[PDB]
Design a binder for this molecule. Structure first.
Ligand SMILES: Cc1ccc(S(=O)(=O)N[C@@H](Cc2ccc(C(=N)N)cc2)C(=O)N2CCCCC2)cc1
Lengths: 36, 259
């Protein structure tokens, strides 16, 4: 466990590592540019 | 998950599942933050009013599922717990403040495509990313609607659910609930006009609320699904443990000491 990041952490194999966004991920990325 | 859609295989690879040794039920979500430790809501273990007090030899844990129901031999790993860590300042008899527990596993667990840790938030990630209107993600396997029960209910999924939910400003959180909200909690959910709905619910407690940084493309756990007055009631918000406000304690137990 560490703060900040395990190098490997929170980077999902089937998506992050595989150059692929999941299906409901741009909903989040949208909620940021509409926020600030 | 109220207003869930089925998960893609592999979407929350940190998602662990809590289970009673005998007879066999799902009790709470939880998350794998190391090969060694599972994070969850303290109420998964000690809620006195309801005879919840779980001994270490009463629970085992499941990592890497997709099905709620059928033992997926190829992918799934079953560990028993070596030790439990509920907080000494977990206030159950008032408002569940500091509803956070930890679970040390007896095996270290072996990561797969399908079994993998989330990141714990640091200062720059909490400060940046925890604002009102940024949505984060809730997963688990529990009810798609509120229930009492009969011989069972009806409203349990096949597959891990997702919903994505806005974090709600504090005034509107404070104001939603009769109940004393601390600086250790936050609420998520859609406000009344807002077109979309969705919530955690009985079965989803313990599970992770995660947020993905556009800085480094990774996930951080910011809440733990702590509580709610019902499952997705208009006017009412979903309550969550500010993991980071409690990063103090998380590392207390993991390093044994060290502030
Ligand atoms: C102080 C409090 C507030 C609400 C409830 S509850 O019975 O309405 N709702 C349940 C079930 C639940 C859990 C999570 C949620 C959620 N995060 N949306 C909603 C409902 C609850 O909060 N818990 C967790 C605590 C143990 C009892 C079960 C009970 C206690």
């Amino acid at each position: 466990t560490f703060g900040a990041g395990e190098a490997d952490c929170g980077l999902r194999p089937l998506f992050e590592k595989k150059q692929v966004q999941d299906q409901t991920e741009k909903e989040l990325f949208e909620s940021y540019i509409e926020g600030r | 998950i109220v207003e869930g859609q089925d998960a893609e295989v592999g979407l929350s690879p940190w998602q662990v599942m809590l289970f009673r040794k005998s007879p066999q039920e799902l009790l709470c979500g939880a998350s794998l933050i190391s090969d060694r430790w599972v994070l969850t809501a303290a109420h998964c273990l000690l809620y006195p009013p309801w005879d919840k007090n779980f001994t270490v030899d009463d629970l085992l844990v499941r990592i890497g599922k997709h099905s709620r129901t059928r033992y997926e031999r190829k992918v799934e790993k079953i560990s028993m717990l070596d030790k439990i860590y509920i907080h000494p300042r977990y206030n159950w008899k008032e408002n569940l403040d500091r509803d956070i527990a930890l679970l040390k596993l007896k095996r270290p667990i072996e990561l797969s495509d399908y079994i993998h840790p989330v990141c714990l938030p640091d200062k720059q990630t909490a400060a940046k990313l925890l604002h009102a209107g940024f949505k984060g993600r809730v997963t688990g396997w529990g009810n798609r609607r509120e229930t009492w029960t009969t011989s069972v209910a009806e409203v349990q999924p096949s597959v891990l659910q997702v919903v994505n939910l806005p974090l709600v400003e504090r005034p509107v959180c404070k104001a939603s609930t009769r109940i004393r909200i601390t600086d250790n909690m936050f609420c998520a959910g859609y406000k009344p006009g807002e077109g979309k709905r969705g919530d955690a619910c009985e079965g989803d407690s313990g599970g992770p609320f995660v947020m993905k940084s556009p800085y480094n493309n990774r996930w951080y756990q910011m809440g733990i699904v702590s509580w709610g007055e019902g499952c997705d009631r208009d006017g009412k918000y979903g309550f969550y443990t500010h993991v980071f406000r409690l990063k103090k304690w998380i590392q207390k137990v993991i390093d044994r000491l060290g502030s």
